[PDB]
């Protein structure tokens, strides 16, 4: 009657406190099948995973594979929160508690991948005492490895204790001698000219040019440890100078991750050290192969364009001390490109990472009037949506209606930019204020406002439930490709009240009833006064003002006066839309 | 001066700070006595006169420094002065806050109900102790590891099991051993039961034991053992890892000894960065 996919849907829709009965209800799948429990944990959230682990600790004997799948699910959630941009990261305390439960249930039986996943989960929280304790616990058991040292140096990347991470990297280089120079030299192969950079994006046969994914993890640890290190010893060490020279002249990886590593790497450097490093590398790589500050970037760009259009104009944009400097870097450098015969590079300003860099430089300065000039001019493109979520918040603090709804309907919706919960809460309030202004003057449709809450919505969780037939199986062939069932979108009750007021002021109370049913279906969010709101909407649909007043008087005589204040506000918002 | 305040209560002259009396300024204890106005009049030290018992005057001002109020149990006259002076002056309402219901607080008393299930067939016993605590916060994983270490030296694990079933409930069985061996297990469990609660800061106030008759067709009894504790205390080791629900060891081992622990490869091994002696 029920499948495993419907059981996973019931698990992912139920809250965290309901993990204990359902595990005890369908316990015939978990008491003897560890692979079934691992598949349940991997297809569910990390909080539900640790709830199921805490429930099964009192009933079954959990294995090391259960905690391994839990740490893998937490690492996948960290990868998703890196990719998407909304939601919170996995806390280091929950990962340490899971590792402590696994080390108290199974002593000296966990693999080193458990410690590796624990260090990778403690890496974004920058908790290095946890890494020191894990290294001491692994050394006391005589199992101390070199990728654990790499991930502990990545954990110890912090402005407080960067010297311990540098000492860990020095001990890693003293133990294993050839991994670090080969991983650095993978960013600069022998025999690389501008024609190789052209053929990497033009020609066929996408060969692997040398960096392995383990070398990519090592380089990410090096990027974190050079972001944490100050600029004084970063320009004196051979390793740091080699990495800074090989990152700006990589030409082997995609420009998005190169731009990300360049934004993270050169942050602690000052402006003069940055421009002298860029001048030195532009001298050596072009001599081997071949205010006043706004003038100093023009001579930096015109000597360094073999297919280096994407990362450099974002790195110099991030290294500028202010956002008006970034606006001048957008305007006067485009004018110099028109002056210095640079028609080919200006097609790369419409790349989404450049406007994302400009919007981030405007967002960290909290400048919405500067961001609106970039919003209304350029074409709508895929924003990485960490900055567009707080730009709508910063536009809401100005308490002005038309610009927010204008940029939402002309830049965010056609580019498919997915906002956070508070951003949509601010945008629906601005839409409601602009619709009330348009109603009192005499343009958001209510169906469009319903679709902007469901289609335009981003959660920090990742859909991972597969269908029953769409799974790589050990027996028989698959009929369909592996498809992921999308989770139904959950709505906060502030979004519920804003959608109710929008569908009332639009003139169609059916949309409010549909939104209330969708909210009761996806998350069981019932309002405290919804039994009166349903009848108010039914009186609105059939034009019954006397019954709408009598139900308000009955809610006043039943509930409090402040509860009937919302019903009176809804009545006076309906009366201006009916008139 | 704004530093010293001299209050003469019952002939005894005590020295205090202006921050002590004006720690709760909204009370009538502080607003009725103008300490900054008396400091401008008397430049040396403020002088006030109170009519209280001098031993009670040490109790109220001693509460302002240590943030703990202890009332005398025997002397009911002095006990009645603290509840009257702090009510008239307004210090009583700020002393005991009424709260309406993350940290966990241990209760004042603690009862432990143990429900045994006995079976006796000609000189052997068979126990099933259901240890149950009274509230949350009691670490029963520390309790069971006190039971498992002391009982492994006496008897093998093929005759008894012990695991945790809830946050405030434990469990222990005994599979058909003699009366000299079963009373050895039951007395060792109930001694580690109270010694775990003595380490939490409690003391055994009272206890009793209850034995039930047989069921009408079987030789099954129900021994009820109840305890009662009270709040007495006023508030690089070795990891011994064990699973919660244990597994039985009947006959030979199905998996070898080296297949239990996990080892890293030799090429991945690094030198120790901390000293080992």
């Amino acid at each position: 009657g029920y499948t495993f996919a419907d059981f996973l849907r019931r698990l992912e829709r139920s809250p965290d406190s309901h993990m204990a009965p359902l595990y005890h209800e369908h316990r015939e799948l978990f008491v003897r099948r560890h692979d079934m429990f691992a598949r349940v944990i991997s297809s569910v959230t990390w909080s539900k995973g640790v709830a199921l682990v805490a429930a099964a600790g009192y009933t079954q004997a959990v294995n090391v594979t259960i905690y391994r799948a839990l740490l893998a699910r937490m690492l996948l959630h960290n990868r998703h929160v890196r990719q998407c941009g909304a939601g919170s990261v996995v806390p280091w305390s929950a990962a340490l508690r899971t590792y402590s439960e696994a080390i108290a249930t199974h002593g000296n039986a966990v693999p080193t991948r458990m410690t590796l996943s624990a260090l990778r989960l403690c890496t974004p929280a920058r908790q290095w005492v946890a890494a020191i304790s894990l290294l001491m616990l692994s050394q006391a058991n005589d199992k101390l490895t070199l990728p654990m040292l790499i991930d502990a140096a990545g954990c110890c990347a912090t402005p407080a204790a960067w010297e311990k991470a540098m000492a860990l990297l020095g001990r890693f280089h003293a133990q294993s001698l050839q991994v670090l120079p080969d991983s650095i030299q993978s960013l600069r192969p022998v025999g690389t000219s501008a024609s190789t950079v052209d053929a990497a994006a033009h020609a066929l046969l996408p060969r692997s040019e040398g960096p392995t994914p383990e070398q990519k993890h090592i380089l990410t640890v090096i990027n974190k440890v050079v972001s944490a290190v100050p600029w004084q010893v970063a320009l004196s060490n051979e390793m740091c100078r080699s990495y800074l020279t090989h990152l700006v002249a990589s030409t082997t990886l995609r420009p998005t991750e190169k731009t990300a590593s360049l934004t993270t790497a050169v942050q602690q450097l000052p402006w003069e050290a940055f421009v002298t490093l860029m001048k030195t590398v532009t001298a050596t790589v072009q001599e081997g192969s071949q205010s006043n500050s706004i003038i100093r970037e023009g001579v930096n760009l015109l000597q360094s364009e073999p297919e280096t259009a994407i990362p450099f104009i974002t790195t110099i944009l991030y290294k500028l001390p202010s956002a008006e400097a970034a606006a001048l870097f957008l305007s006067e450098a485009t004018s110099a490109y028109r002056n210095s015969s640079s028609a080919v590079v200006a097609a790369a300003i419409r790349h989404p990472v450049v406007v994302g860099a400009l919007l981030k430089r405007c967002a960290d300065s909290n400048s919405w009037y500067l961001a609106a000039s970039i919003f209304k001019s350029t074409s709508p493109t895929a924003i990485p949506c960490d900055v567009a979520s707080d730009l709508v918040i910063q536009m809401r603090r100005a308490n002005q209606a038309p610009l927010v709804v204008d940029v939402l309907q002309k830049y965010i919706v056609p580019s498919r930019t997915k906002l956070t919960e508070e951003a949509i809460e601010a945008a629906l309030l601005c839409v409601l204020v602009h619709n009330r202004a348009l109603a009192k003057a005499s343009g958001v449709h209510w169906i469009s406002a319903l679709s902007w809450a469901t289609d335009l919505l981003e959660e920090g969780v990742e859909s991972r439930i597969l269908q029953t037939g769409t799974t790589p199986s050990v027996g028989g062939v698959n009929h369909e490709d592996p498809t992921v069932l999308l989770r139904k979108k959950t709505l906060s009750p502030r979004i519920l009240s804003l959608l109710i007021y929008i569908c009332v002021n639009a003139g169609s109370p059916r949309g409010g009833l549909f939104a209330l049913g969708y909210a009761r279906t996806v998350s069981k969010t019932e309002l405290e006064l919804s039994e009166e709101i349903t009848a108010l909407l039914y009186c609105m649909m059939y034009d019954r003002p006397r019954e709408a007043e009598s139900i308000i008087q009955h809610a006043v005589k039943k509930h409090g006066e402040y509860k009937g204040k919302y019903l009176g506000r809804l009545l006076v918002a309906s009366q201006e839309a009916k008139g | 001066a704004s530093d010293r305040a001299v209050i003469n209560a019952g002939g005894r002259r005590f020295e205090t700070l202006f921050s002590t009396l004006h720690r709760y300024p909204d009370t009538p204890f502080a607003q009725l006595f103008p300490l900054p106005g008396r400091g401008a009049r008397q430049h040396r030290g403020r002088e006030f006169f109170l009519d209280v018992t001098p031993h009670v005057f040490e109790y109220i001002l001693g509460f302002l420094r240590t943030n703990q109020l202890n009332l005398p149990a025997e002397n009911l006259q002095i006990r009645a002065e603290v509840v009257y002076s702090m009510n008239q002056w307004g210090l009583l309402e700020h002393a005991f806050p009424p709260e309406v219901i993350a940290v966990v607080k241990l209760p004042d008393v603690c009862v432990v109900q143990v429900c045994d299930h006995m079976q006796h067939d000609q000189g052997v016993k068979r126990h099933a102790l259901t240890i149950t605590y009274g509230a949350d916060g009691f670490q029963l994983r520390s309790l069971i590891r006190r039971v498992r270490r002391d009982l492994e030296r006496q008897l093998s694990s093929t005759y008894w099991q012990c695991y945790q079933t809830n946050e405030r409930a434990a469990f222990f069985v005994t599979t058909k051993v003699a009366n000299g061996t079963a009373d050895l297990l039951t007395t060792s469990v109930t001694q580690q039961l109270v010694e775990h609660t003595e380490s939490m800061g409690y003391s055994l106030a009272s206890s009793y034991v209850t034995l039930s008759p047989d069921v009408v067709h079987t030789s099954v009894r129900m021994l009820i053992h109840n305890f009662t504790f009270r709040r007495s205390r006023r508030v690089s080791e070795t990891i011994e890892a064990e699973p919660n629900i244990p597994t039985m060891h009947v006959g030979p081992r199905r998996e070898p000894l080296n297949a239990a622990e996990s080892i890293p490869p030799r090429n991945e091994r690094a030198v120790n960065i901390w000293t080992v002696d």
Binding site: I103, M136, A140, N141 | R148, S236, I239, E240
Partner: peptide
């Protein structure tokens, strides 16, 4: 620095 060892059973302590 915590060394993790397995607690011995009665068949392991009194092995003959």
């Amino acid at each position: 620095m915590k060394r993790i060892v397995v607690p011995h059973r009665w068949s392991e302590m009194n092995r003959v």
